[PDB]
Amino acid sequence: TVSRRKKIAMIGSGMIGGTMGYLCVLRELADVVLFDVVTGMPEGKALDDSQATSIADTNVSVTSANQYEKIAGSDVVIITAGLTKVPGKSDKEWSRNDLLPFNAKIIREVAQGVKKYCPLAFVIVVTNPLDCMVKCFHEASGLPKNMVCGMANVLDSARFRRFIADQLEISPRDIQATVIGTHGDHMLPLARYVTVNGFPLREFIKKGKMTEAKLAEIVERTKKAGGEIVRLLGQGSAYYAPALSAITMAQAFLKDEKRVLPCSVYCQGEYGLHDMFIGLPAVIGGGGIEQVIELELTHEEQECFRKSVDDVVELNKSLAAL
Amino acid sequence: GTVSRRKKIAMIGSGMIGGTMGYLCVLRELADVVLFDVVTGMPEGKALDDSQATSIADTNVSVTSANQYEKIAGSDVVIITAGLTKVPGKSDKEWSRNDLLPFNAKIIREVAQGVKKYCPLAFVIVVTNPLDCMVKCFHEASGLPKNMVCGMANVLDSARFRRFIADQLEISPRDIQATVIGTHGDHMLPLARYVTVNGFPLREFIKKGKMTEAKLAEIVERTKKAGGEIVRLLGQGSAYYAPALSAITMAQAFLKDEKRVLPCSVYCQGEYGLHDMFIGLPAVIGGGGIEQVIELELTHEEQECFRKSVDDVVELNKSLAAL
Amino acid sequence: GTVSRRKKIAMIGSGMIGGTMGYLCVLRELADVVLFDVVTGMPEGKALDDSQATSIADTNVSVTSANQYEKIAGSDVVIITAGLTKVPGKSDKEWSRNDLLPFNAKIIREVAQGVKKYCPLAFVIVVTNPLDCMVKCFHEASGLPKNMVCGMANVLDSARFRRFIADQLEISPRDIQATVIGTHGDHMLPLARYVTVNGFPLREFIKKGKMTEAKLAEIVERTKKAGGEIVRLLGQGSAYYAPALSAITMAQAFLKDEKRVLPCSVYCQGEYGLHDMFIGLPAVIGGGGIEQVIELELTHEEQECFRKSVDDVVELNKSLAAL
Amino acid sequence: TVSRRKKIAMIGSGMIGGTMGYLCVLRELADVVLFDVVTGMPEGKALDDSQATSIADTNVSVTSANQYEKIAGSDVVIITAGLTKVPGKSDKEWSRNDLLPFNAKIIREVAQGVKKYCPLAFVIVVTNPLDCMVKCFHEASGLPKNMVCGMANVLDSARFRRFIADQLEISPRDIQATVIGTHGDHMLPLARYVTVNGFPLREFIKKGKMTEAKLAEIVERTKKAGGEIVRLLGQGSAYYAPALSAITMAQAFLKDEKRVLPCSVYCQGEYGLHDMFIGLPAVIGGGGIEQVIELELTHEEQECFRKSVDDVVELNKSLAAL
Ligand SMILES: NC(=O)c1ccc[n+]([C@@H]2O[C@H](COP(=O)([O-])OP(=O)(O)OC[C@H]3O[C@@H](n4cnc5c(N)ncnc54)[C@H](O)[C@@H]3O)[C@@H](O)[C@H]2O)c1
Ligand SMILES: NC(=O)c1ccc[n+]([C@@H]2O[C@H](COP(=O)([O-])OP(=O)(O)OC[C@H]3O[C@@H](n4cnc5c(N)ncnc54)[C@H](O)[C@@H]3O)[C@@H](O)[C@H]2O)c1
Ligand SMILES: NC(=O)c1ccc[n+]([C@@H]2O[C@H](COP(=O)([O-])OP(=O)(O)OC[C@H]3O[C@@H](n4cnc5c(N)ncnc54)[C@H](O)[C@@H]3O)[C@@H](O)[C@H]2O)c1
Ligand SMILES: NC(=O)c1ccc[n+]([C@@H]2O[C@H](COP(=O)([O-])OP(=O)(O)OC[C@H]3O[C@@H](n4cnc5c(N)ncnc54)[C@H](O)[C@@H]3O)[C@@H](O)[C@H]2O)c1
Ligand SMILES: O=C(O)c1nonc1O
Ligand SMILES: O=C(O)c1nonc1O
Ligand SMILES: O=C(O)c1nonc1O
Ligand SMILES: O=C(O)c1nonc1O
């Protein structure tokens, strides 16, 4: 075989892992390995997803595994391995930060597997607490700084954009709305940078297409979106938009698209941040994280951002203290 | 002042398959979506998740949830997945689509009243098991035209048949034409004789050593057991990815009048000598609904098998009337 | 008995752009296609070529040719490319869209009568140059609603603006929002101040050294001269690939009610203080046709430029009445 | 750049070359190099096609060239370089065989360029007389037998399928109709192998959905399709379906799809043919031509096939005698 297919390993074959494998089948993006510690269920997802290639009229290989040697040769690795909720807690008390002691353990295990079998892969961490887990994976795996990132802000921005799109009655394709920062209650939806095909939202508000109170409400909804879905589902958390967000990132790498997709990235001076990962606008291409966009935040915005930073910083301190 | 309105598909049942189909509509920007279910909460969680996905897919369709049939009014297509997947008490090995009869007949008749009242002009695709029995139940309970009601099953069965063959021949499933007809159950009939590689009979490939007769037979058996295998491996519910895509592919064939050949459970009126019943047959789906029902020249042997398939639907239909 | 009919797009003019748009309809299975032209023979050659392509694309739409307006009846959308691309006698360097006025005004008025008679309910997209002048000419000659007629131009101009910026910043054009408004000609206005990278002002990228002001200006000039450069390089006719995609993108926004922001020549009724004329402005295209006309808070400087753009269309419209 | 984009070189940037570059832009299939001996026009096509990426929201590089070093690193090379008609002749007398003395020269030039700058590419010859030209390119370039093929039968089959699809009122996706043999008047539309999703056409005829006379007519139309389009266009020949046919082949290689796409391939015993290229059913994947399907032709079919073979054989004799 002179021209081999792209290969993506889904470390974690739950709701998101399986849905991402499905997206690969639909777009014929790459061969898929549905890895997981659970036996049985992954083979079931693998069979379901592979059988879908017939109807999709595409041809990629979807298999399951529980041995890390199976992910060797992966171009991309998307990690969803972990718990979605704390055993016992109610949905009313769902908190991403509480998954720390449970998932760090899992992420470290995965890091060792990747370091050993596919150290040249581009890694996309999904597992929560996202920003903390990406840093955890980076340290444990030893992979280059530009080849590791966490999917979060693309999802947050998707919500931000959809809400605005509904109000303005314009397609979300033409709404540029970005959320940066830690993926949690202190994420920062950049209201001042929201544009309609480049045109500042401020101009649409001055014309009565949206009220300042509605924008504020949309900014709040964006932050609460994840918990809202957790509350409404009853079982687990969001997986459709999250799966597409991660795959969109994977494709940007695979096809060297150079798409601007906000994701938790390694900081070396940007925004005055050092030795940590946090959500920021970035460009993803064949070189991994090729650009970290440094925006000129206002003082008011810097305060909000600093609080968002405190969250990861304390989260990372708790991680170390274990 | 909208002159050009988007297509609308109501998903009656917002479980694993319903939500996945809504996701598909988002990705292809196929149609606005209504995720209907008797359960409140979950559907809206699905609607939010799927609608938020439009942003990343850069498409624009509306995805909302509902628990009131008035919401499905105007739907161009209705795909029904409402129903149980497994019978409480039964082991995974004991899983049988037929045991679902007394639980889902009730549900399908309710849905029938809802469609009859709010969107009687829709093209209806039943998915709920026992499929062939449920489609017939929906059709008589709803009163919709015979060419506007069908059941999704054989597209899924054929997909498996095709994927298995494709793997063995090292050829894309796009170029494997393998068809399964009959009742969606243990007596479904994978038409081994009609398997082709871009029109070239499989037997020529076998004669040339590409694969053996024994493997063909192994694959035929595997096709029949595919559902239960996944039920066993998942440990919860049943398949939904391929099922959702099968149904949406049929829905799209209708919406865009593609005239695709997609085997599904259809109303019989003389084909293969059958009357007043639904069963899997190769059909052509287009803007006119089920536009053609292909009647294949089956051999006596295949007829023997097909009759066992019919016996099953006939029995189920009897068990239904016996309620 | 077809309940769900495919969309229908009539291509008035089956030259380079018309045929390419039909090709696009085939690939996306967007709609049935009618390749209309006064010339006989060539259009049918295009129809055969494009229809045969459906097989390889595995899609199913109808592509036919015509020379009689009765054939475009029922069209949901009409894209007009009928007209000359260059003036015989003129050198390539002398190429100017304005010189096409006396040759295409005649053609556009004929097409107007055809649409008025056979498919007056269509969403019409004019492409023929001089664009802004031709769209206005079509609108008054046809009598169609003001929200159902527009001209494709600025989407193409913006595409160039975006591609140039994208190359310099090493970012996909998907994430570059660069817009051009005004008359489709040497006085078009690439809005440098409104150029963003996913909403982030370009000036921040310039301030950080990613690219210089001089390059921005070089690109602004390049955007204006793009058409003539291609005319010069091709040596025959003018651009058609990006043009065809620009028009089909607008057509799709209408057909599937996507509500996309696509700058195009639209009917003015007070925006920027303009009345009874068409000119390029950012607009929102959906199922209601031109659903929104965005009026940007232009600075005096940008207003000065925009006024020169308006002066051009006003002059052309005068030259037209003077016929 | 860890993950580089696929690269396709269009040797010949005329109607087909440009249209293929356009398809790459639409599908984001690969970066495109529009090569040609003509200067000016290719840069115009390159600009037009690249500008289309913005509207398509894709990101690939489309450039032009007239120096072979520019095609270095190409994964695929599609050759359309050549004349479409004999200078002076009327459209009434159009014949693919007459382009021989004009295009062999051109194909040999291209062979030297490919051999030198991208010998590891998968080559798809389009230039006519197709079957003769593929053999000409193979001999001159020295590329492996499985990495060189000629696009023709996919186009012929597309016509065959479309005509049948219209009559049966079924999508061409579900019509399997194949044409094999030399791309010319003696091409062989395999009427006995036409199926509707695997179901023999014979069964649809017995049911009155199509008449035997209509099938015969469709078989004739298929052979005459190319000349018909030449007659109707006035300028050149077909390019839309031809461009999609070649790109579909290129994609099958690039993404290792293993699609059954009839194309002129190297024969080593198949159908009793030796040292020549001719249209036959084949599977295209990452290994190039991975399979040559040998069908059990009836005696009647073998006669027709042998005449089709005679055509290339004599064509190849004329090539040698130059
Ligand atoms: N960043 C974001 O925006 C975002 C969005 C949604 C969910 N998430 C997070 O994604 C994660 C997965 O969500 P989900 O819905 O797919 O959950 P899920 O429970 O459906 O799947 C998680 C899977 O991880 C597997 N797993 C556990 N330990 C493992 C190990 N050591 N190795 C391999 N696999 C292991 C489990 O068996 C399970 O199948 C959660 O931690 C969730 O909080 C993040
Ligand atoms: N034909 C086929 O090939 C095929 C393939 C897979 C599954 N199925 C069948 O499809 C059905 C759905 O499968 P699933 O995986 O989505 O199951 P699921 O359990 O995930 O979802 C079924 C949904 O139906 C809803 N429901 C129940 N009663 C209802 C009512 N009266 N009105 C509206 N909604 C109601 C439930 O609340 C639930 O959300 C099952 O019966 C299954 O056996 C058929
Ligand atoms: N708005 C833009 O941005 C833009 C971009 C490119 C080209 N254009 C303009 O688009 C037009 C078409 O460009 P093209 O490349 O397709 O040109 P073309 O010469 O290839 O095709 C124009 C076609 O119009 C046909 N035609 C002439 N009179 C007609 C009539 N009365 N009825 C029906 N058809 C008639 C011709 O026979 C010819 O086939 C030109 O006027 C060109 O200047 C505009
Ligand atoms: N196999 C098939 O099914 C099929 C179908 C259609 C056309 N064709 C053949 O494809 C070829 C191209 O068709 P087209 O419509 O694109 O023609 P075209 O005239 O539009 O383009 C051919 C291009 O080849 C270029 N060229 C000439 N000599 C060259 C050289 N030495 N190096 C590089 N480029 C050179 C020309 O400058 C011209 O731009 C013709 O020979 C035609 O007969 C084959
Ligand atoms: O943000 C979400 O929707 C989410 N769901 O599970 N984890 C998350 O971060
Ligand atoms: O066929 C299947 O996979 C299936 N799963 O649930 N019902 C079915 O028919
Ligand atoms: O802008 C162009 O490229 C163009 N080509 O022909 N007319 C035009 O406006
Ligand atoms: O077959 C065709 O259409 C053709 N057109 O130009 N050369 C050919 O072979």
Rounded distance, CA D238 to CA A210, Å? Answer: 52
Q: Are A172 and C174 in contact (CB under 8 A)?
A: no
Rounded distance, CA A177 to CA A193, Å? Answer: 7
Task: Give D144's DSSP letter.
Answer: -
Residue C66 token pair: 């015509």
- Helix, strand, coil abundance in chain B, percent, nearest 5: 50, 20, 30
B58 in a labelled binding site: yes
User: Which neighbouring-strand residues pair with C181?
Assistant: C189
Rounded distance, CA B271 to CA B269, Å? Answer: 6
- Of the residues A154, A167, A169, A199, the best mutation for testing chain C's interface (the one with the most C CB atoms within 10 Å of its CB) is A199
- CATH number of the domain that residue B67 is part of: 3.40.50.720
For chain A, list the contacting chains (3+ Cβ pairs, <8 Å).
Answer: B, C, D
- Within 10 angstroms of residue A105's Cβ, the number of other Cβ atoms is 12
B38 in a labelled binding site: yes
Are D206 and D132 within one domain? no
Mark yes or no for CB contact D256/A122 under 8 Å. no
Question: What is the full DSSP assignment across B301-317?
Answer: HHHHHHHHHHHHHHHHH
Q: Count, in order, helices (H) and strands (E) of chain B.
A: 9, 16
**Would you call B144 an interface residue with chain C, using a CB distance cutoff of 8 Å?**
no
Name the packing angle between helices A41-56 and B241-255 (round to 10°). 20
Mark yes or no for CB contact B173/A57 under 8 Å. yes
**Spacing, Cα A212 to ligand 1 middle (Å):** 37
- Within 10 angstroms of residue C143's Cβ, the number of other Cβ atoms is 11
With contacts defined as CB-CB under 8 Å, which chain A residues touch D257?
28, 58-59
Are A258 and A145 within one domain? no
* CA angle B223–B228–B230, rounded 5-degree value: 90
SS (H, E, C) chain C: CCCCCCCEEEEECCCHHHHHHHHHHHHHCCCEEEEECCCCCHHHHHHHHHHHHHHHHCCCCCEEEECCHHHHCCCCEEEECCCCCCCCCCCCCCCCHHHHHHHHHHHHHHHHHHHHHHCCCCEEEECCCCHHHHHHHHHHHHCCCHHHEEECCHHHHHHHHHHHHHHHHCCCHHHEECCEEECCCCCCEECHHHCEECCEEHHHHHHCCCCCHHHHHHHHHHHHHHHHHHHHHHCCCCCCHHHHHHHHHHHHHHHCCCCEECCEEEEEECHHHCEEEEEEECEEEECCEEEEECCCCCCHHHHHHHHHHHHHHHHHHHHHHCC
Residue with tokens 């509904």: A166
Residue B319 token pair: 């068990």
Rounded distance, CA D257 to CA D267, Å? Answer: 22
User: Which neighbouring-strand residues pair with D200?
Assistant: D195
Ligand 6 pocket test, pick from B156, B241, B246, B316 with the greatest ligand atom count within 8 Å of Cβ, gives B156
User: Which neighbouring-strand residues pair with C200?
Assistant: C197
**Spacing, Cα D12 to ligand 8 middle (Å):** 16
How far does chain C reach from its first CA to its final CA, in angstroms?
49
**Spacing, Cα C112 to ligand 7 middle (Å):** 22
Are A156 and A302 within one domain? yes
Q: Are B128 and B13 in contact (CB under 8 A)?
A: yes
Closest C-alpha among A269, A268, A271 to residue A296: A271
Closest C-alpha among C80, C81, C99, C79 to residue C90: C99
Are A106 and A86 within one domain? yes
Are C53 and C64 within one domain? yes
Residue C249 token pair: 């993108």
- Cα distances from C153 to residues A258, B148, C246, D30, D195, in angstroms, run 27, 43, 8, 27, 46
Rounded distance, CA C192 to CA C205, Å? Answer: 13
* CA angle A22–A24–A26, rounded 5-degree value: 70
- Within 10 angstroms of residue C101's Cβ, the number of other Cβ atoms is 21
- Cα distances from B61 to residues A22, A160, B74, B238, in angstroms, run 20, 16, 15, 28
Query: Who among B2, B148, B257 is closest to C6 (CB)?
Result: B257
Closest C-alpha among A164, A155, A93, A94 to residue A124: A155
Residues 33-72 of chain B whose Cβ lies under 8 A from any Cβ of chain D = 58
**Spacing, Cα C206 to ligand 7 middle (Å):** 30
Rounded distance, CA C126 to CA B6, Å? Answer: 24
Are B2 and B145 within one domain? yes
For chain C, list the contacting chains (3+ Cβ pairs, <8 Å).
Answer: A, B, D
Are B273 and B291 within one domain? yes
Query: Who among A25, A58, A162 is closest to B51 (CB)?
Result: A162
Residue with tokens 């830690």: A182
Domain boundary (D90, D115, D150) is at D150
Rounded distance, CA C84 to CA C78, Å? Answer: 18
Are C4 and C120 within one domain? yes
**Would you call D298 an interface residue with chain A, using a CB distance cutoff of 8 Å?**
no
Helix (H) or strand (E) holding A205: helix A201-206
Q: Are D6 and D58 in contact (CB under 8 A)?
A: no
Residue with tokens 């459209």: D91
How big is the B-D interface in CB pairs under 8 Å?
A: 86
How far does chain A reach from its first CA to its final CA, in angstroms?
47
For the beta sheet containing B200-201, the strands, ordered from the edge strand earlier in sequence to the opposite edge, are B176-177, B196-197, B200-201
**Spacing, Cα B239 to ligand 6 middle (Å):** 6
Whole-number CA gyration radius for chain D:
19
Give φ, ψ of D296 to 5 degrees: -85, 85
Burial B18-52 (b: 16+ CB within 10 A, else e): bbbbbbbbbbebbbbbbbbbeeeebbbbbbbbbbb
Rounded distance, CA A68 to CA D85, Å? Answer: 59
- Looking at the structure of chain D, the number of domains it has is 2
Name the packing angle between helices D212-233 and C42-57 (round to 10°). 120
In ligand 1, which atom is closest to the CA atom of A42?
Answer: 39
Rounded distance, CA A233 to CA A255, Å? Answer: 34
Residue with tokens 């990101």: D59
**Cα dihedral sign for A215, A220, A222, A225?**
negative
- Helix, strand, coil abundance in chain D, percent, nearest 5: 50, 20, 30
Task: Give D77's DSSP letter.
Answer: E
Residue with tokens 């197709």: D130
With contacts defined as CB-CB under 8 Å, which chain C residues touch B5?
257, 287
Looking only at the bridges linking them, the beta strands covering C180-181 and C176-177 are unpaired
Range of the domain at A106: 1-150
Are C144 and C164 within one domain? no
Q: Are B18 and B243 in contact (CB under 8 A)?
A: no
Residue in chain C closest to D50 (alpha carbons) equals: C163
Residue D176 token pair: 């399997």
Looking only at the bridges linking them, the beta strands covering B63-66 and B32-36 are parallel
How far does chain D reach from its first CA to its final CA, in angstroms?
47
Bin A123: left if φ > 0, else alpha if -120 < ψ < 50, else beta.
beta
How far does chain B reach from its first CA to its final CA, in angstroms?
49
Task: Give D170's DSSP letter.
Answer: S
Closest C-alpha among B21, B157, B142 to residue B81: B21
Is any ligand 1 atom within 6 A of the Cβ of residue A64?
no
3-state class (DSSP) for residue D114: helix
Are D138 and D187 within one domain? no
Closest C-alpha among B81, B280, B284, B279 to residue B161: B280
SS (H, E, C) B107-125: HHHHHHHHHHHHCCCCEEE
Looking only at the bridges linking them, the beta strands covering B32-36 and D274-280 are unpaired
Rounded distance, CA C109 to CA C37, Å? Answer: 14
Looking only at the bridges linking them, the beta strands covering B196-197 and D288-292 are unpaired
User: Which neighbouring-strand residues pair with B196?
Assistant: B177, B201
- CATH number of the domain that residue A258 is part of: 3.90.110.10
Residue C291 token pair: 């659903």
With contacts defined as CB-CB under 8 Å, which chain D residues touch B174?
257, 259
Are B141 and B205 within one domain? no
Are A8 and A92 within one domain? yes
Q: Ligand nearest B84 Cα, by number?
A: 2
Residue in chain A closest to B171 (alpha carbons) equals: A59
**Would you call A258 an interface residue with chain D, using a CB distance cutoff of 8 Å?**
yes
- Of the residues C59, C200, C294, the best mutation for testing chain A's interface (the one with the most A CB atoms within 10 Å of its CB) is C200
Residues 226-255 of chain B whose Cβ lies under 8 A from any Cβ of chain A = 226, 229-230, 232-236, 239-242, 245-246, 249
Q: Which residues does A77 contact at the CB level (< 8 Å), separation at least 6?
A: A8, A9, A11, A71, A114, A118, A121, A122, A123, A124
Residue in chain A closest to C195 (alpha carbons) equals: A198
- Helical ranges in chain B per DSSP H: 16-28, 42-57, 101-118, 131-142, 154-169, 202-207, 213-234, 241-255, 300-321
Residue in chain A closest to D7 (alpha carbons) equals: A255
Resolution in A: 2.3
- Cα distances from D185 to residues D95, D181, D281, D308, in angstroms, run 9, 10, 18, 8
**AA identity, residue C73:** A
Helix (H) or strand (E) holding A155: helix A153-168
D84 in a labelled binding site: no
Residue with tokens 């590419």: D121
Q: Are D164 and D198 in contact (CB under 8 A)?
A: no
Domain boundary (A150, A167, A199) is at A150
How many whole angstroms from its chain centre is CA A33?
A: 19
**Would you call B132 an interface residue with chain A, using a CB distance cutoff of 8 Å?**
no
Ligand 8 pocket test, pick from D98, D128, D233 with the greatest ligand atom count within 8 Å of Cβ, gives D128
Residue in chain B closest to A14 (alpha carbons) equals: B234
Mark yes or no for CB contact B200/D281 under 8 Å. yes
With contacts defined as CB-CB under 8 Å, which chain D residues touch A256?
1, 3-5, 59
Residue with tokens 């009337």: B321
**Spacing, Cα C269 to ligand 5 middle (Å):** 46
In ligand 5, which atom is closest to the CA atom of A130?
Answer: 9
Domain boundary (D115, D130, D150) is at D150
For chain A, what's the residue count? 322
Closest C-alpha among D92, D147, D96 to residue D118: D147
Q: Which residues does B257 contact at the CB level (< 8 Å), separation at least 6?
A: B286, B287, B288, C2, C4, C5, C6, C60
- Cα distances from D126 to residues C94, C201, D245, D273, in angstroms, run 37, 47, 10, 22
With contacts defined as CB-CB under 8 Å, which chain B residues touch C6?
256-257, 287
Q: Which residues does D109 contact at the CB level (< 8 Å), separation at least 6?
A: D81
